[PDB]
Design a protein around this nucleic acid. Structure first.
Ligand SMILES: [K+]
Ligand SMILES: [K+]
Ligand SMILES: [K+]
Ligand SMILES: [K+]
Ligand SMILES: [K+]
Ligand SMILES: [K+]
Ligand SMILES: [K+]
Ligand SMILES: [K+]
Ligand SMILES: [K+]
Ligand SMILES: [K+]
Ligand SMILES: [K+]
Ligand SMILES: [K+]
Ligand SMILES: [K+]
Ligand SMILES: [K+]
Ligand SMILES: [Mg+2]
Ligand SMILES: [Mg+2]
Ligand SMILES: [Mg+2]
Lengths: 186, 147, 45, 126, 101, 142, 126, 50
RNA sequence: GAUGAGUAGGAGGGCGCGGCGGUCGCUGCAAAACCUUGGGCGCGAGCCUGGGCGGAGCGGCCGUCGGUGCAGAUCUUGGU
RNA sequence: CCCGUCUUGAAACACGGACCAAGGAGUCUGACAUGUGUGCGAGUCAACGGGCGAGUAAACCCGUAAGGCGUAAGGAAGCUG
RNA sequence: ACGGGCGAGAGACCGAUAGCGAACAAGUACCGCGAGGGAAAGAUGAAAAGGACUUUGAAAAGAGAGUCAAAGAGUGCUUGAAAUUGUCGGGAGGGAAGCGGAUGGGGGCCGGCGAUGCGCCCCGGUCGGAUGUGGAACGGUGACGAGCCGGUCCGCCGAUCG
């Protein structure tokens, strides 16, 4: 016998390929597999790793946030592995070079009208093979409804986790355990 | 999809994944929300604080239509303006766009966010917040009350 | 724009085709989407 | 046809994995079933009992699925299907499907002779 | 009585988004223009002049099946129809007695 | 392939009317391709007759040791009727091999399958000779 | 393709109707084609089989036989002809049932009703 | 097999990438994740191979 | 290169049955089913095939669906 | 050492099982929740209904200030935002 | 609105232990004082052509014979698994049998069970032979232009090889 945990084998699971059946995504994965193998670029490795991620792990980026992050770097190609959505709270749109998996129609129209371009990852490979002069961006991963329910249980002290309730109102989980006048608070 | 159900993988394993000792009996802990206070108290308290008891006053025969009050923010006011009106306003500084948020279906205007830079706006609404009115006045526009 | 030839029968008299290639002919081909939609809608009958 | 395979075929075990107690009860068939009983001596692997299959018995990958003649089997239902083996006659042999009639079997045999494709059951229905 | 007897209020139907339906239709139309995919789907198009196959509007006025067959022969789509006719056969299994023969 | 061959392969590698599969999806699985423009009848992107603009086709003509060598025209991809440039060779095996080499490799059409084309031509020639003169040896000695 | 909503394509219903058809419907169901000469003369394709009609068999073991019909067994869906018979083990002679669709009418027994039906059939064909 | 009239109507039915469809209110054809699916052209380009 | 125990339990990849949408085939020169100290493949679920019987249908492949896999339940019916 | 089972412990003087064939047990539905695939995206959802249409239970099209969910929350409430 | 009545159209439904209890003289036979309870049971053959006649037997039937493509389809008649039983043949057996692993004796089966080709020469027989010259159609690249390059087939002068 040998004193090893699980015979020395790994017990962690990570994505090694996309779970999607999108043929275009598969072609992009092949392209960036080749790029990673034959260039050893950290940017390419990050792009390849993110190409495997699930939908919730590729959150969208708003146009206003994209403009804010690109301020002072309009000459660099901003790259996001995800979707870019329009923001009606953004008034002035500068000329930007943007690469993403997908653009909403409004966001694409606004970028093109402002004078930028919307690029795919094949075009990004053609333009910056090693990711030179790029601004790699990620959307807000934890900014979703499901996350609010995670963490410490609502009923424990110092917890601000949202509870699961079928309706909102005075009669829905507000009396005992939420007030000093009805039993205890928190 | 039956062929993907895990019970198919458990064919020939006796307990069907529910254990030899514990087994899968009918209602080992009661039906529905039984025992909320007695043997499910820990669950109810830790996951559903506030569940037991009553608070506030009652309201017999309450109708929501008389409480209907949609709201919009000043950061979203500009989105209501059509593109042609928008560039007309940009070109001409002697006049300001006149937005009737009621026609788009809003009763009250709230003061979240900011407006376009150096743009006056005449906003007509049923109600408005103090901050929203202050922001409009600072932008150089005006507020009108209607019903 | 690419041009598509129009086949002419014996009965007809003019071989004038030259129809521009419609944009839908260059749409993305997604077997996964097609199979998903087909399998779901074939249940409706 | 000269088979391409060169490595000798080695079988780790040539005996069938017979289900326990299939000799005892007629209703219990021979096809393997892993015992799940709590006390089963076969499941516990008591020495002198029925052996259970495991991946350790796996055949060498180079010689896996190779017939004793040195080729691999491919079922053919017609002479048109036969032509698929034209460029693989040194690795693959053709076996005519059991339901093919004698009339079609004759044509398949003739075409295979033309193409230098080995038939495992060329004498059937003759 | 059978275990869990079948009931009529099983969810027979599906409600797919219209945008996804249109995506699928557009994809199928785009694929119909690829000769490789048309061949891969089992259609005999070796004699078709060009894909997409666009014919004169005079075909819309044809009234007789013989004239329709002649038009198919002229445009080179008749081998596919002949293959379809020759493939006519009785359905194997219980379906042949369920009004799908 | 009016669309890129890589996309065509991504679509058709899962299923197509020319794909022959046997013995399940385990270790016993056997796969082949039936399309006439696949030199080795192999279900792979390299030899695929559906996912390549430039394809070589070698088979036996009806009569008189005539070998059909056809190449897919690069520009007439949307014209199935005139998609193949055909040549029927009736001369000696040496001349046929020279023609195949010239039309496959010397023009950089598909140099990667020059060996496959030559092997297919040799197999077709041997099959024609045997079909003419009957079997005369078992070809079992090594 | 059927379009009338009051006709069924159900195999079960069609078989039930055919096998429970009364005698009047069975008469029409038991129709036979006319010979070439009668077809040309009357401009009619097929007629119900009558007792005193001359009939030539065109299918089966009696493909060349001909004679006068002697019985129309509607309950058994068959007709009997003059000399189309066979010998039993006893040695006695018994007529052999022949389906009307497998014979050809060479001469019709004509009456007022038969002539009227022939005229009606010819009128539609024109 | 398309008739000429149907082929012509295709453009007005399904619109295009730039403009919207007349027969489908506000519909626009989808765009792929890859502008050019010819993988060899990208992989063997001067930029990558340099 | 390292490594290999597994009840309760979880998961992955596969085998098998019957339909549906497609596709490729077999069959009176004999289909299904059944029978067989014939032979072979796979660790295995299983699969391919010789021979017989039978006398009219059946199968492979890609998706998709389900009243889909038995040694037990003093289990049910029938048979011995 | 006879399998299956309950059991700390079964070959058990523990229970079921004389034998064979066929049938035989985590299903369907509603409300949620995580995860994953797909479409769109500050929007999204035409299948209540209407116009039609494989002469048609399918498929296709249609949202007027319709509606649901989301886009603002905190208070018992007045109310503020 | 509509699991009743009359009349229709369909099905990703069941296929005789399934599907209504009932595919049949089924709410029948049968049971209970009664209210009630309630089965089992489909398939010769294309056509009865449903087995004449001889012989043995009291008879049922047997042995011959005849019909049919078939009786290896003979009226509870498409096919005919297992449990269980008889006969013949092989084998084993001091108070169980069966089973895992290794050989051996005997039997059974297997000819892709296990080859006879290849290279270099001589003789004879057939089929074709340039980088030359014309024709037919055509391709690679380029820009489904020019230019360059190129293969297949056919007709001739030389070459005299494969
Ligand atoms: K479980
Ligand atoms: K347990
Ligand atoms: K109150
Ligand atoms: K057994
Ligand atoms: K194991
Ligand atoms: K099939
Ligand atoms: K067998
Ligand atoms: K299936
Ligand atoms: K127990
Ligand atoms: K016991
Ligand atoms: K809405
Ligand atoms: K308060
Ligand atoms: K019953
Ligand atoms: K029989
Ligand atoms: Mg079922
Ligand atoms: Mg509304
Ligand atoms: Mg037996």
């Amino acid at each position: 016998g040998i004193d090893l945990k699980a015979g020395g084998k790994s017990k962690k699971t990570k994505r090694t390929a996309p779970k999607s059946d999108d043929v275009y995504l598969k072609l992009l994965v092949k392209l960036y597999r080749f790029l990673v193998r034959r260039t050893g670029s950290k940017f390419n490795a990050v792009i390849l790793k993110r190409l495997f991620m699930s939908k919730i792990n590729k959150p969208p980026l708003s146009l206003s946030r994209l403009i804010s992050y690109a301020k002072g770097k309009e000459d660099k190609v901003v790259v996001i592995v995800g979707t870019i959505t329009d923001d009606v709270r953004a008034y002035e749109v500068p000329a930007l070079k943007v690469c993403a998996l997908r653009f909403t129609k409004t966001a694409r129209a606004r970028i093109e009208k402002a004078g930028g371009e919307c690029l795919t990852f094949d075009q990004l490979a053609l333009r910056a093979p090693l990711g030179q002069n790029t601004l790699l961006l990620r959307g807000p991963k934890n900014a979703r409804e499901a996350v609010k329910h995670f963490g410490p249980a609502p009923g424990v002290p110092h917890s601000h986790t949202k509870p699961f309730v079928r309706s909102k109102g005075r009669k829905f989980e507000r009396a005992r355990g939420r007030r000093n006048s009805r039993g205890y608070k928190a | 999809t039956t062929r993907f159900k895990k019970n198919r993988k458990k064919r020939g394993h006796v307990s069907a994944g529910h254990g030899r000792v514990g087994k899968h009996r009918k209602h080992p802990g009661g039906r529905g929300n039984a025992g909320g206070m007695h043997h499910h108290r820990i669950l109810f308290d830790k996951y559903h604080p506030g569940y037991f008891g009553k608070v506030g006053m009652r309201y017999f025969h309450k109708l929501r239509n008389k409480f209907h009050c949609p709201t919009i923010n000043i950061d979203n006011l500009w989105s209501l303006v059509p593109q042609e009106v928008k560039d007309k306003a940009k070109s001409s500084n002697a006049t300001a766009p006149f937005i009737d948020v009621t026609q788009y279906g809003y009763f009250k205007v709230l003061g979240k966010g900011v407006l376009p830079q150096n743009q006056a706006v005449v906003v007509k609404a049923k109600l408005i917040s103090k901050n929203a009115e202050k922001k409009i006045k600072e932008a150089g526009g005006a507020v009108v009350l209607t019903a | 724009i690419p041009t598509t030839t129009v086949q002419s029968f014996e009965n007809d008299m003019a071989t004038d085709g030259a129809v521009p290639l419609p944009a839908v002919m260059k749409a993305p081909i997604r077997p996964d989407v097609v199979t998903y939609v087909h399998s779901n809608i074939s249940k409706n009958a | 046809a000269v088979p391409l395979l060169t490595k000798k075929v080695v079988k780790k075990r040539v005996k069938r994995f017979i289900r326990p107690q299939s000799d005892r009860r007629i209703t219990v068939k021979e096809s393997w079933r892993r015992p799940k009983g709590i006390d089963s001596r076969v499941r516990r692997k008591f020495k002198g009992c029925v052996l259970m299959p495991n991946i350790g018995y796996g055949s060498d990958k180079k010689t896996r699925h190779y017939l004793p003649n040195g080729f691999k089997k491919f079922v053919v239902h017609n002479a048109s299907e036969l032509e698929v083996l034209m460029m693989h006659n040194r690795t693959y042999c053709a076996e005519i499907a059991h339901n093919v009639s004698t009339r079609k079997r004759k044509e398949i045999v003739e075409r295979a002779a033309q193409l230098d494709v080995v038939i495992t059951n060329k004498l059937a229905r003759l | 009585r059978m275990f869990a007897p079948t009931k009529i209020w099983r969810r027979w139907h599906r409600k797919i988004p219209v945008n996804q339906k249109r995506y699928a239709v557009a994809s199928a139309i785009a694929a119909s223009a690829v000769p490789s995919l048309v061949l891969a789907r089992g259609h005999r198009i070796e004699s078709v002049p060009e894909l997409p196959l666009v014919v004169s509007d005079s075909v819309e006025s044809i009234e007789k099946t013989s004239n329709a067959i002649k038009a198919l022969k002229q445009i080179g789509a008749y081998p596919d129809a002949e293959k379809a006719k020759d493939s006519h056969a009785i359905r194997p299994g219980k379906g042949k007695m369920r009004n799908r023969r | 392939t009016t669309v890129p061959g890589q996309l065509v392969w991504e679509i058709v590698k899962k299923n197509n009317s020319f794909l022959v599969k046997e013995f399940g999806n385990g270790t016993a699985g056997v796969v082949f391709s039936k399309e006439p423009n696949n030199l080795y009848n192999l279900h792979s992107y390299k030899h695929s007759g559906l996912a390549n603009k430039k394809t070589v086709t070698i088979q036996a003509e009806g009569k008189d040791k005539s070998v059909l060598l056809a190449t897919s025209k690069t520009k007439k991809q949307n014209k199935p009727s005139t998609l193949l440039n055909k040549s029927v060779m009736k001369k000696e095996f040496r001349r046929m091999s020279k023609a195949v080499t010239n039309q496959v490799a010397d023009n950089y059409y598909r140099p990667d399958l020059k060996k496959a084309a030559l092997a297919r031509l040799s197999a077709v020639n041997r099959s024609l000779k045997v079909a003419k003169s009957g079997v005369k040896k078992k070809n079992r000695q090594a | 393709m059927k379009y009338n909503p009051r006709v069924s394509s159900s195999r079960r219903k069609s078989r039930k109707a055919h096998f429970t058809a009364p005698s009047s419907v069975r008469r029409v169901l038991m129709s036979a084609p006319l010979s070439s000469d009668l077809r040309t003369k009357y401009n009619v394709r097929s007629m119900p089989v009558r007792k005193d009609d001359e009939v030539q068999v065109v299918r089966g073991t009696y493909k060349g036989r001909e004679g006068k019909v002697v019985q129309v067994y509607r309950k058994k869906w068959v007709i009997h002809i003059e000399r189309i018979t066979r010998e039993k083990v006893n040695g006695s002679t018994v007529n052999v049932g022949i389906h009307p669709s497998k014979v050809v009418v060479t001469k019709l027994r004509l009456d007022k009703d038969r002539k009227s039906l022939l005229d009606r059939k010819a009128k539609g064909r024109a | 097999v398309w008739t000429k009239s149907a082929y012509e109507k295709l453009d007005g039915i399904y619109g295009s990438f730039d403009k919207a469809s007349e027969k489908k209110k506000g519909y626009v054809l989808p765009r792929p994740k890859m502008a050019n699916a010819d993988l060899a052209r990208i992989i063997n380009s001067d930029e990558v191979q340099s």
